[PDB]
Amino acid sequence: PQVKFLERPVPDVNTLALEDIDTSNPFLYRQDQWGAYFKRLRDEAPVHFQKSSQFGPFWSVTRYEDILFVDKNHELFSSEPQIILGDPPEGLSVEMFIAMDPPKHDVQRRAVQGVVAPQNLKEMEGLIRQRAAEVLDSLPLDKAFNWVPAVSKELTGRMLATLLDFPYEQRHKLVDWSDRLSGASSATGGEFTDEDIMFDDAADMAWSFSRLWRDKEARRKAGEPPGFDLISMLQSNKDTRDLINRPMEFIGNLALLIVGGNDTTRNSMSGGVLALNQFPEEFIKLKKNPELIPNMVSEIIRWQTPLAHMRRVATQDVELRGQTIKKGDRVLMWYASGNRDERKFENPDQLIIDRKDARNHISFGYGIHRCMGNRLAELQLRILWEELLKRFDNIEVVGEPERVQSNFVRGYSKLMVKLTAK
Ligand code: HEM
Ligand SMILES: CCCCCCCC(=O)O
């Protein structure tokens, strides 16, 4: 049941009773209230029950420490049946291993893990660097342009096409299908309300992925050598040779990977540019010390936290910081709060590119569901920033960033950038 969320000014959090703070509001990030809202919960109600929202009753866990406890304890806090606050559109549910408990989760993850293993990422690195070079060489100088479509959306589309060996000139479909899956109003308070186009996406996605399998199956029978892409790898491994005979698992986990990498990588790419503009000393420091890029990528991902939360269901009664979460209660782990928790990160709101524990961020989560594409994400941002510093002396954000409506995605729709050449 899809709802067109209407933007009302969000109240100053100090003018509310604790019981009334609703973190499911998808305009908290846009209106720059998320910070104050999460600070007050961290300090006064770090394990907080909201009895009423558009999405029903849910708990918010906002302290770094408590997020680790919940994320680690998969047996107490199930990932089934969903991993977002709300529900997917009626009859348009997709079986992803992210929304799965062991042993089933482990089997499906093992089947697909190899594609983003550092060994296989080495095979792709040259192509990802080349496709990055092309886009950056195409950008206008001394002219403000929208970074989101031009670089972030573009590089992300290419990344997903590279990974799947998807028809390169149909790569916009992977972004479009991903946006409408993860941005459904019913799931995340996103802007997407049209369920007809979502049924179209399901048909278009099941067709195109079944086609890509058959095309690769033919080239292999024709004796062509297996490539570095996911379908090649799945067709090589004997467990996943007949994966097209498990259509739920096949389309589900293919959809999971594209949803997985889409907004996440894009908003990391946009977020990084903004973070270095709001903290101009960090950019001066990055240019003098470009060996900081790897750690900066960790700090950008901590600072952005592209996915605000992940949801779980208590499998039994669980005591947590003096609160009793009841069997069946929905629990949000607010990673966006944990990565700003001064109990872990001194000066948690500042971008510090040489932050020595940057890598201890929880943007990828923690435990058996820790991000499968972490290495791919870090690679793409490292590559982006290596290629940027080669070409550009300054990256100047102009005007105000426009932010996406969601309680799940922390993203940008517009980020106006002026480039200066070296
Ligand atoms: C900045 C980029 C990214 C961030 C911030 C991110 C964040 C996350 C988070 C928070 C989880 C779940 C953690 C948990 O429940 O404990 C996750 C899982 C996952 N991510 Fe990512 N991710 C990113 C990039 C990617 C990319 C590029 C891919 C694939 C190409 C990907 C694929 C996945 C998959 C498959 C899972 C499910 C893991 C499992 O359930 O076993 N992610 N990611
Ligand atoms: C880690 C990426 C997985 C996000 C799943 C969102 C799909 C839905 O809204 O049902």
26 within 8 A of 406, measured Cβ to Cβ: yes
The first and second tokens of residue 328, run together, are: 């069946």
Nearest to 331 by CA among 317, 316, 311: 311
Residue from 24, 79, 84 whose mutation best tests the ligand 2 pocket (most atoms within 8 A of CB) = 84
Residue 34 CB-density burial (10 A; 0-12 exposed, 13-18 middle, 19+ buried): buried
DSSP 183: T
Q: Which residues pair with 417 in a beta bridge?
A: 145, 397
> What is the rounded CA–CA span in Å between residue 125 and residue 8?
45
Q: Which atom of ligand 1 is found nearest the CA of 71?
A: 16
Whether the upstream peptide bond of residue 140 has omega within 30° of 0, thus cis, is no
Phi first, then psi, for residue 313 (nearest 5°) are: -120, 120
Answer whether 100 contacts ligand 2 (Cβ < 6 A): no
> Quick check: helix, strand or coil at residue 24?
coil
> Quick check: helix, strand or coil at residue 371?
coil
Whether the upstream peptide bond of residue 290 has omega within 30° of 0, thus cis, is no
Answer whether 301 contacts ligand 1 (Cβ < 6 A): yes
Resolution in A: 2.0
Residues in the chain: 422
312 is in an annotated binding site: yes
CA distances from 70 to 21, 47, 158, 298, 313 (A): 21, 11, 35, 22, 10
Provide the total of helices (H) and of strands (E) in the chain, helices listed first: 15, 10
Answer whether 205 contacts ligand 2 (Cβ < 6 A): no
In this structure, the number of other CB atoms found within 10 A of the CB of residue 93 comes to 14
